[PDB]
Each structure stands twice: as C-alpha cells, then as structure tokens.
Amino acid sequence: HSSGLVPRGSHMANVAIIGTEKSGRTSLAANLGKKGTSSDITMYNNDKEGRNMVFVDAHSYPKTLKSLITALNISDIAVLCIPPQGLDAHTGECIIALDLLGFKHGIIALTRSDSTHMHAIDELKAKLKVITSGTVLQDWECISLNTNKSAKNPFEGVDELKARINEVAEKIEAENAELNSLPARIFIDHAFNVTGKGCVVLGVVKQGISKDKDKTKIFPLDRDIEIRSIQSHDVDIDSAPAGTRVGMRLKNVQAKDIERGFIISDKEIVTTDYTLECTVSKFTKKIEPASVLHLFVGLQSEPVRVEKILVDGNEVEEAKPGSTCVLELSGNKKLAYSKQDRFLLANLDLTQRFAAYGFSK
Template sequence: MESYNIFCYNASDYIKEIAKIGTNSDILLYHRKDGDMVMTFIEPVKYPEKVSSLTDSIYPSDIAIVKVSTINKDLGEVIVALDLMEKKNGIIIAGEEQKPIIKKIIENTSLKDYKFFNGKPMELVEQIKSMKIIRDKNSNMTVIDHFFKVKGVGTVALGFVLSGSISKHQKLILSDLDKEVEIRSIQMNDVDVDTASAGSRVGLALKNVEPSDMERGMFLSDKPFEYAETIKGKVVLQRSLKMDLGDNFEVFVSDIMRFQRGKFENDHIILDKKIPIVKNKVALSNNNIVPRIFGTINL
C-alpha cells in the first residue's frame, strides 16, 4: 500500500470534496483511499494564531498544497516555512493572473519547482497521484502526534512512519523517556495490519507506556536516541530576511513536530529541554517577529 501525506494551506474547500475528516485538534487530518493508495491531508487549523500548528502540519508531509486567495503576510510566512523546512514537492492552486507574482516570490526557494493548478478537486487527486515520493527504507523512525487511552486496548498513539517500517509485536525505543515499548497492534484506516512502511499514517496500540507520559513529537525507533540541549551551529537566516540575534533572544526549535523553547547565549542556543536528534538541521521561530519562522541551524 502506498501512502502520501499532504500539507494543505487555505485549501479546505478542495480537500473536503475529496477526503473524509479524521483526527481534529490544532491540526486537522483528512483521509482518502483509492485502491492501494492512501492520502492523508494535514491542515493547520489553528494557524495563523499558532505557528506550531503550521510547522507541526508541515513536518510529516511529503507534498504541500498551497491555495492562493490573497497575497498577504500569512501566505508569505507559509512560503518561508516550507522553504526552511525544505519541502520541495508541491502544488500551488492559483489563477492565471496570480501565477507571475507567485513565480517571482518562490523562484529562489524550495518551492521553485511546485506545479501550478487551477482545476477541479478530483483533478487535484490525479495531480497528486502523478507525483513521485522517494522513501528512506533503511532507518526506522516513527513520529507521534496524538495519543490517548482506549478501554480494553490501552495506550493508543497516532503518528506517521517517517522511514523504514514497523511491525506488530516489534519492540522499539520511545524517545525522551528512552524506554522500550512494544507494538501490540497496528491500524491503517481502521483496518488491522501486520506491518506499515514509510509514509504510512498509523494507529499503534502500545505496551509499557501511559498517555500521561507522552507528548507530541516523540519518536519510535529501533536504535537508541542522541539528544541536544545546546546547539552550537551557525544560524542561517531565510534568504529574504535580515536581523541580529543577540544574547537572550528567544527562539523555538520548530520542525521536529515540537515547539521547544530556548535562548541565544554566547552565539549558541541553550534549550529549556533536550530534543532528540533525528535530522541534521532544524528550523527556528520567534513569536514576536514577522515572519515568525526565520532560519535554520545545524544540529
């Protein structure tokens, strides 16, 4: 079964025509199944109030859909976020009169190869199907975004298999707690399965952990985790921005599906809480500037 995860900005009128609503919190997920293909659409419903709603929706996505109604600061911030989080596969829904302006805005960003679209919802489905996603089949990593207790089942976690694959009865390490948990069962689209590969949206019944011990942005892996509490890399600002980052400047690591606070001190970032190192580079945000997501730093 092939799975595509699609970030959606300002496109709910399209998505509601082609998919069914699923999990709803500060991010809203929709699901569509066509034969052996499953599409999960992720919408940041608390954006623009919460920039974490935006970055948490972008993080697990393979493809981005951006519908242009008005060219304003919110659209600009979305473009900056997609650029810094290096989301290179996408579709822009825009009218002919908007295309030249948008092309100019994205020409030097990660969005430069996005396809323009101005058709009907079902035509959008075909456009998504035509896109190719390259998966990492080697490393084993799943990110968790929701979790709760189910009577008769126990702890259930919802998330995305980012790379590799997972199996029923497999024992994995849960980040932050660094404890071994067992996958009792796996569901995809409310159907029990024995395995789930990279890209899959999954519901996992977990043994040896309580929902009260969990938080969004935890990871499951077959290998031990390394962590960062201090980040000493050089901040690279988004190419259109200029700013000074002095001591005590508040910053949030914002694209590991977690919004972790820290501050600059002596040219490095001291985090309030350690973060698992699952990627080489993370994006940074500050709630008091525009755009709020402003740069990247290497871990």
C-alpha cells in the same frame, strides 16, 4: 509474506493543505476526505480512491506556527492555497517556511476560481512564477480551482489537483521506499487511551520499516516499549514502511506520559541544549546573544535562548539576516532528535516569524 488477504501496497500520500486566512484551505481539505483526528490540526482521510491518503489542514495557522510546522513535518506533499489577490503576509510566511524546510514536493492551489476571471488568474500565476523563483516552490504547478458546487464551473480544477497529487505521490513512494533499509523511526503526532486496549499513538513512519511486536524505545523518555499492534486506516498490519501513517497500540508506556513530538526508535539524541549550524532567513531581524527564539525539530517546539553565536569558529555579537552561523542554544525541556532532523528557529513576535533553519553539529 504479509498479514491479511491482500497486501496494503505501496500506495499512499500524506498531504498538508496550508495557506493564509480565507484561502479556502478547510473547504478544500474537507472536500478531499472524511474528517478524522482533530486537535490544533485536522486530518481528512481518504483511502477510498486508491492510495491511503491523509490531508492535514493546519487550521490553527496563522494563529500558531506549530500547527503549520506539525502539518508539514508529518506530510510529504504540500498544497499551498492562495486566493485571488492573496499575496499577503501569511502567504509570504508560508512560502518562506516551505523554502527554509527545503520542502521538495508541492502544488499551489489558486483557490476560489469562481470568484475571479481567467485573465486575473493568468496575472496571479505570472506574479507567482516571480515570487517563487530561486525557492523550492519555483517549479511547483499552479492549479486554478474551486470547491463550490453552485459555481458556473463547479469544482473545476479539483480533478486536476487530485491527478497531480497522485503523480507526485508516485515519486514520493519511490523515495520513501529507499528509506526502508534504514533503522525504523516513527514520529508521534497524537496519543490517547482507548477503552479495551490502552495506549494508542498515531504517527508516521519517517524511515525504515516498523514491525508488529517490535521491542524498541520511545524518546525523550528513553523507555523500553513493545509495539502490540499496528493499524493502517483501521486494519491491523504486520509491518509499516517509511511514509506509512499509523495507529499503534503500545505496551509499557501510558498515553498520559506521551506528547506530540515523541519518537519511537531504538536510539535518539536527547538534550536541552543545542549547537546548530544555521542559515538565517533574509527576511528576519539580526540574531543576538541572550535573545529568545522558538525552536522546532520533528514535531516538538519550545522556547530557547541564544547563548553564543559563532562564525568560522570565531565568536561574534550578531548573525545578520541572510548569513550562516553556528548558534549555541539552551532550553528547559528535553527534546529528542537525530542529526538528520532539520531544526527551524522562529521569533513568534515578528510579522514574518521564521528566522532560520539549522542542523545539529
């Protein structure tokens, strides 16, 4: 039994469209759905073709990492856009990030196909098979495409991209369905007041099934709240299973006290210090005590200081690139997370900024 005249169905896909500068990312996203929410990232919604699809353009990247990380942590499928001769620094950083995130499902879009030739495209695909070997992108399909209605072959590859997205989405739907039996958790990516109905948050159910009228909590505030209503692509629904992108009206909390990264659940860890079992990127500088890094977990990001570095329980003076260690970190703001949330560490001053991934010990 469900609300409405027809169930929503288990058909949806949250897709992140990312990549280096001038890679055709925005043009692709904009041609895949209609522009909706826009901040440092932009949602393009398309629920007119079967699945409730949301494409997130991380348009503030490469300028900021949070744009990229937020887009990836609210999506289940990544589309990495690489233009002709596009093997540059940020394309490399994107590959590293996806791999440090253990991002399972994705596709590489070899954009701007009308500006190149099949033989060059075959050569770029060959190079990529190599660059992605031994990474989570190793078996991702590479699809040549363009979004130029005036090209000799207008929009070639777009139909193929859509088809592959739907296939991958089918696998994701089954994986998310398995999470329905867990306690509910919703990551909030936006929050604002709406005249006539108050506090509204937009986010995605990460696990379990959130239900209209649930009495739960919001973290890091650790405050009781009630879910007044849940909307999916503008229609009220009685429940929202894992993977569902939602809009929710909340009772007992003001939009002004909610930030991207807050979590709705019955329980979350809230701390300002962290002890993480980490794996350091081979493509970063050795990490040392007293150094400063940037931490990302869920949809939160903040600077942190390295207080202590240990290996096999013993304290050391550095963690070299490509090593595993335990990092004791300290920050100023309270962040919310559960043990299953993967942490990312970065050094915003480097060229390739991702330094490591880790989990709370």
